[PDB]
Amino acid sequence: KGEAIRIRSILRSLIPLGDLVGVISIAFQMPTIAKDGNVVEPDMSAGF
Amino acid sequence: NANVVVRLLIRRPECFGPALRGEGGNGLLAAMEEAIKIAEDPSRDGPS
Amino acid sequence: EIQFLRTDDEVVLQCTATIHKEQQKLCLAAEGFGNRLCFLESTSNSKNVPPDLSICTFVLEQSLSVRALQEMLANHRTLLYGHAILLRHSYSGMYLCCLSTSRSSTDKLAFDVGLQEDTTGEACWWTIHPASKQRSEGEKVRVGDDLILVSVSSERYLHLSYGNGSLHVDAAFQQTLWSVAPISSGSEAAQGYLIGGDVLRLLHGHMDECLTVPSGEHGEEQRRTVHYEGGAVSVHARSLWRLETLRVAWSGSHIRWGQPFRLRHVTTGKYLSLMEDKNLLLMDKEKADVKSTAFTFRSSKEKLDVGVRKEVDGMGTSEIKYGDSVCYIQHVDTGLWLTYQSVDSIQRKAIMHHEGHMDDGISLSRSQHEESRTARVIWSTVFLFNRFIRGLDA
Amino acid sequence: MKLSQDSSQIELLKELMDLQKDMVVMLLSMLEGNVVNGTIGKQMVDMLVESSNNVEMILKFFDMFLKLKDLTSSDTFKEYDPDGKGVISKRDFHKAMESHKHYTQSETEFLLSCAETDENETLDYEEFVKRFHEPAKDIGFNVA
Amino acid sequence: RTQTGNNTTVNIIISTVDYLLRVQESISDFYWYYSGKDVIDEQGQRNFS
């Protein structure tokens, strides 16, 4: 269907594939156990 | 519904944001990298 | 009464700019040979710089309704709003389309607008939309109106890129008003009569000497001079001259007595003009001024003029006839008449004189479309090859 | 051309022809009280020449049934179909089409397609004519 | 057509033909929709009616 084909063309024009690949390439931070014995939590409402 | 929504979204390109301006836009990847930097910086993420 | 845009009528797409707080009038242009990319040519500076409307004129082949055209794509009509149109570039014969390629200039979503040989694809077709709120989809399309065109394939409006220092035509989501100006009507045109933009040869007298520049000797210093030459010179690109009117709108109208125009040498790209010392000299587009370049025809050698008359906004009466009619060349302001120096293949100099001869009458012969297109190709190729050679030498 | 071929669209076809009759009635109320060389007549002639092809096709469509009634009234039709029940074979109908010699192959095949037949490959001319000829009569008179 | 007494006059005659133009545009579009299909469904038939 030409309508759907051109919709996909518009979507690809709006979003390059490289940006999507790079966003997945970005990694987030590991909550880590501390010296005392407590695992420090980065915010769930802040950050990746 | 999807066709109408995407036509309105592309007719008003300003809905996308500063990343997807198309004119002088750093891109989605750069936008999320600068947003991560905002997240580490307290003054730029928080009300301060 | 009111004229309406119809199919097979030759028009130009017109847009206006706002550069440094003034309205600059820019026509859409594209060259068939070489690159297909479209550009804009200034028409506001018509007095200082001649606009080249030859590559700017366009012809509308078909105006189908949207869904009927969709059924086409799955498998003189008056223009109506909400109809995708097929625009064919008059000179090249190719069709305006959305190239889907981007120069990565100021917008990654934008697609360059060029010319496509084949008619297939939604890029060739362009829907017309009423930019004026008085106009509604389904109303008749006026000849004088502002229209916004949307690409059927890319759904991107025909846009003017203010962002770049050099204005560019582009396919973007942003709108721009385009005004359509009728250049000529094919059906209304009558055979054998002079029209605007036609390529013709200024053959003189029974001796059949045509007004021409010297033979190609790789020297513009020789080529700029003009003279009367006869013989085999008749069938060559040198003898071809093209008539361009000062008036942009309805430029394809029938040419009448006493109407100023600009005679252009198609091969050299230079315009016929006059020096202050009363001699004819070819001289460049950029520095070709309106007063010197302009010439007019008169029915008789009789000196008194027709004065000032009303310019019709249409095809007009067909006065000048190819062959039968005898024309006299005269300057627009100085009123000097084109004369031969009577210097004794013939190589008689073309001179300008206060009174002139008794025998200064000239006839006109229509040039074949094939030869005209070939001469334009020759000029557009020699220019590119000259700049190439200059770059290699540098 | 489309509704006539299908047997299930005869009611919509009749509604359409009633609409055709009404529009022609309005077009005649246009001309009521018109002088010679009137602007009204000039404009309607311009309208007709603008819509020339559709007018031609409509006129041919009407003329098919106008000639069909005459062919049915003709005696050669009775000599091909002597019986009173009037269920002529499609084969005999086609040979009658070309025996009439006023009907070209295109008109013959169009009438074949528009004609409705039972499992016996046979059609009834009485049903055919009452379905098509009588509706066309008054609209064709209005156009004339 | 002309309300001579009233300060403002409205052309019901023109508005009627405007509505007729819109309805004929809709009918033509609905025809173009049912152009591809071999047979018209009962829904489309009632809409046509």
Swiss-Prot record, chain C:
Name of the protein: Ryanodine receptor 2
Parent-protein start and end of this portion: 10 to 435 of 4967
Compartments reported by the entry: Sarcoplasmic reticulum membrane
Induction section of the entry: By TGFB1.
Domain writeup: The calcium release channel activity resides in the C-terminal region while the remaining part of the protein resides in the cytoplasm.
Question: How is the polypeptide modified once translated?
Answer: Channel activity is modulated by phosphorylation. Phosphorylation is increased in failing heart, leading to calcium leaks and increased cytoplasmic Ca(2+) levels.
Q: How does it assemble?
A: Homotetramer. Can also form heterotetramers with RYR1 and RYR3. Interacts with FKBP1A and FKBP1B; these interactions may stabilize the channel in its closed state and prevent Ca(2+) leaks. Interacts with CALM and S100A1; these interactions regulate channel activity. Identified in a complex composed of RYR2, FKBP1B, PKA catalytic subunit, PRKAR2A, AKAP6, and the protein phosphatases PP2A and PP1. Interacts directly with FKBP1B, PKA, PP1 and PP2A. Interacts with SELENON. In cardiac muscles, identified in a complex, composed of FSD2, CMYA5 and RYR2.
What disease does the record describe for this protein?
A: Ventricular tachycardia, catecholaminergic polymorphic, 1, with or without atrial dysfunction and/or dilated cardiomyopathy: An arrhythmogenic disorder characterized by stress-induced, bidirectional ventricular tachycardia that may degenerate into cardiac arrest and cause sudden death. Patients present with recurrent syncope, seizures, or sudden death after physical activity or emotional stress. CPVT1 inheritance is autosomal dominant.
As for what it does, the entry says: Cytosolic calcium-activated calcium channel that mediates the release of Ca(2+) from the sarcoplasmic reticulum into the cytosol and thereby plays a key role in triggering cardiac muscle contraction. Aberrant channel activation can lead to cardiac arrhythmia. In cardiac myocytes, calcium release is triggered by increased Ca(2+) cytosolic levels due to activation of the L-type calcium channel CACNA1C. The calcium channel activity is modulated by formation of heterotetramers with RYR3. Required for cellular calcium ion homeostasis. Required for embryonic heart development.
Please spell out the taxonomic lineage of the organism that makes this protein.
Eukaryota, Metazoa, Chordata, Craniata, Vertebrata
Q: In which tissues is it expressed?
A: Detected in heart muscle (at protein level). Heart muscle, brain (cerebellum and hippocampus) and placenta.
Residues annotated as domain MIR: 76-131, 138-183, 191-246, 252-309, 317-367
Family per similarity comment: Belongs to the ryanodine receptor (TC 1.A.3.1) family. RYR2 subfamily.
Swiss-Prot record, chain E:
Top-level taxon: Eukaryota
Q: Where in the cell is it found?
A: Sarcoplasmic reticulum membrane
**What about PTM?**
Channel activity is modulated by phosphorylation. Phosphorylation is increased in failing heart, leading to calcium leaks and increased cytoplasmic Ca(2+) levels.
Task: Explain what induces or represses this protein's expression.
Answer: By TGFB1.
Tissue expr = Detected in heart muscle (at protein level). Heart muscle, brain (cerebellum and hippocampus) and placenta.
Family, per entry? Belongs to the ryanodine receptor (TC 1.A.3.1) family. RYR2 subfamily.
Question: What's the record's remark on domains?
Answer: The calcium release channel activity resides in the C-terminal region while the remaining part of the protein resides in the cytoplasm.
| Role played | Cytosolic calcium-activated calcium channel that mediates the release of Ca(2+) from the sarcoplasmic reticulum into the cytosol and thereby plays a key role in triggering cardiac muscle contraction. Aberrant channel activation can lead to cardiac arrhythmia. In cardiac myocytes, calcium release is triggered by increased Ca(2+) cytosolic levels due to activation of the L-type calcium channel CACNA1C. The calcium channel activity is modulated by formation of heterotetramers with RYR3. Required for cellular calcium ion homeostasis. Required for embryonic heart development.
Known disease link: Ventricular tachycardia, catecholaminergic polymorphic, 1, with or without atrial dysfunction and/or dilated cardiomyopathy: An arrhythmogenic disorder characterized by stress-induced, bidirectional ventricular tachycardia that may degenerate into cardiac arrest and cause sudden death. Patients present with recurrent syncope, seizures, or sudden death after physical activity or emotional stress. CPVT1 inheritance is autosomal dominant.
Q: How does it assemble?
A: Homotetramer. Can also form heterotetramers with RYR1 and RYR3. Interacts with FKBP1A and FKBP1B; these interactions may stabilize the channel in its closed state and prevent Ca(2+) leaks. Interacts with CALM and S100A1; these interactions regulate channel activity. Identified in a complex composed of RYR2, FKBP1B, PKA catalytic subunit, PRKAR2A, AKAP6, and the protein phosphatases PP2A and PP1. Interacts directly with FKBP1B, PKA, PP1 and PP2A. Interacts with SELENON. In cardiac muscles, identified in a complex, composed of FSD2, CMYA5 and RYR2.
Name of this chain's protein: Ryanodine receptor 2
- Covered part of the full sequence, start to end and full length, is 3859 to 3907 of 4967
